[PDB]
Structures are given as structure tokens and as C-alpha cells.
Amino acid sequence: VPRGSHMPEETQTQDQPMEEEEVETFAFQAEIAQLMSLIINTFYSNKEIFLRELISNSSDALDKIRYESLTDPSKLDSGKELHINLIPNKQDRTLTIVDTGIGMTKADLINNLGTIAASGTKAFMEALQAGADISMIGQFGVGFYSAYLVAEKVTVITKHNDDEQYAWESSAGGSFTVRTDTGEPMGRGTKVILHLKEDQTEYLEERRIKEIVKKHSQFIGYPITLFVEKER
Ligand SMILES: [Mg+2]
Ligand SMILES: [Mg+2]
């Protein structure tokens, strides 16, 4: 049956087999859940310190590459730059903090980002009751949850040399999920995707992001770059 020309639908390749992603759901440790609800539902004047906290975490994960090379010289062989990118997306109302640090394994996500008690949590909640500035969160071992000052949902995609790529996600409310991530491989490191609250969209603006990096994150020790989508 001779053909000279086919239409796109005719030569569309068959899909790759559908992948299964395993998902597990975990409750927050009780005092973490209480802290998240305090953070979400209280007015604070200095919410901009979330970014300091996330940049701090990335800088710590980058410093670990340096040191892990003393017990595993392999890492010296990676060609990846040690750096942080800040990626606002005004279309989707997200701010993404990307690093090429060590990343997290699946058990690191479960144990580090919600199921284990930080010993300062109760003290910090009492300091907040007594009127402390939210800025002091870092010093109490629970800085990651400052994300919820500005974000209604947080997704963390991460890949560690010793595990496969995983996605942690939570909209608070007492639980989070961890699910194998078979989508776009991100390479070693972590991406924290903040789905911003409607009244916190200032943190998509280039001037506002530059202002808070300069105010609170001047000793990262690694290049940080802000990607700005061209105005159409
Ligand atoms: Mg079709
Ligand atoms: Mg931290």
C-alpha cells in the first residue's frame, strides 16, 4: 500500500512503558506539626528570612561535597559546579532554590524533614509565644519549616549519589509524602519548590529577591545566580 507522505499522528512513536512510582505517607512528629501550624497561621513581620534558611541549607549541603571528598575522592571527579540557582516562575507562582549539594536519600527525607523531633522545637514555640522574632528559627534546629511563612505547598526533589531521585511534598495539615521520582533527572543535589501564597508573590520579583539575598545571605561561600525570565 504505497505511501509518499505520512501525517504526524501516523508516525507518532508508541509511548515508553508507564512507570510506577511508589508513594508513602508519613505524619509529622507532633511538635513539628504544631510548629508548622503556628508558622502558617500567625502573622510575622519579617517573613523574608525563609530564603536565608533555605540558602543556608544549600550552603551546608555544598560544604559536605568538599568534605566527603576526604573519605571518597571520587567526588573530585564530578564536573558539576558547586552553586545555588534561584528560579522564580511568575506563570506558576513558584520560587525554586536549586543546589548541587550532596542531596538526600529516601531515608534522609523521611528522618530529616519531618518524622524526628528537633530538641529545640518546644523551646522555640515558647519563644514565639513570648514574642520572639521568627528570624530566630535557625538557631533552634527547625529552619526548613520557615518555608511555610510564604509557601502553601513545598515540593523537594533530591538526588544523592547513594540513592535514586525522590520527591518529598507537604501542604502541611499534619502529613507529608515521599515518592520515587522517575521524571526529569536533576543530577546530584536538591531543588526546593515553593508554591507561594497569594499575598507573598513579591518573592517572584527580581529586585525583592536581590534585596533579601544581600540583606541576609552574603557569606554563602558559593556562587548564587538568579534566573530572570525575560519579559515578553
Ligand atoms: Mg494524541
Ligand atoms: Mg538549616
From Swiss-Prot:
Subcellular location as annotated: Nucleus; Cytoplasm; Melanosome; Cell membrane
Q: Which residues bind ATP?
A: N57, D99, A118, F144
> Which residues does this entry mark as bearing N6-acetyllysine?
K64, K90
Where is the PTM Phosphothreonine found along the chain? T11, T13
Subunit structure as annotated in this protein's UniProt entry: Homodimer. Identified in NR3C1/GCR steroid receptor-chaperone complexes formed at least by NR3C1, HSP90AA1 and a variety of proteins containing TPR repeats such as FKBP4, FKBP5, PPID, PPP5C or STIP1. Forms a complex containing HSP90AA1, TSC1 and TSC2; TSC1 is required to recruit TCS2 to the complex. The closed form interacts (via the middle domain and TPR repeat-binding motif) with co-chaperone TSC1 (via C-terminus). Interacts with TOM34. Interacts with TERT; the interaction, together with PTGES3, is required for correct assembly and stabilization of the TERT holoenzyme complex.
- What's this chain's function? Molecular chaperone that promotes the maturation, structural maintenance and proper regulation of specific target proteins involved for instance in cell cycle control and signal transduction. Undergoes a functional cycle that is linked to its ATPase activity which is essential for its chaperone activity. This cycle probably induces conformational changes in the client proteins, thereby causing their activation. Interacts dynamically with various co-chaperones that modulate its substrate recognition, ATPase cycle and chaperone function. (Microbial infection) Seems to interfere with N.meningitidis NadA-mediated invasion of human cells. Decreasing HSP90 levels increases adhesion and entry of E.coli expressing NadA into human Chang cells; increasing its levels leads to decreased adhesion and invasion.
User: What family classification does the UniProt entry report for this protein?
Assistant: Belongs to the heat shock protein 90 family.
Entry note about domains? The TPR repeat-binding motif mediates interaction with TPR repeat-containing proteins like the co-chaperone STUB1.
Protein name according to UniProt: Heat shock protein HSP 90-alpha
Origin organism is Homo sapiens
Q: What is the lineage of its organism?
A: Eukaryota, Metazoa, Chordata, Craniata, Vertebrata
Positions spanned in the full protein? 1 to 226 of 732
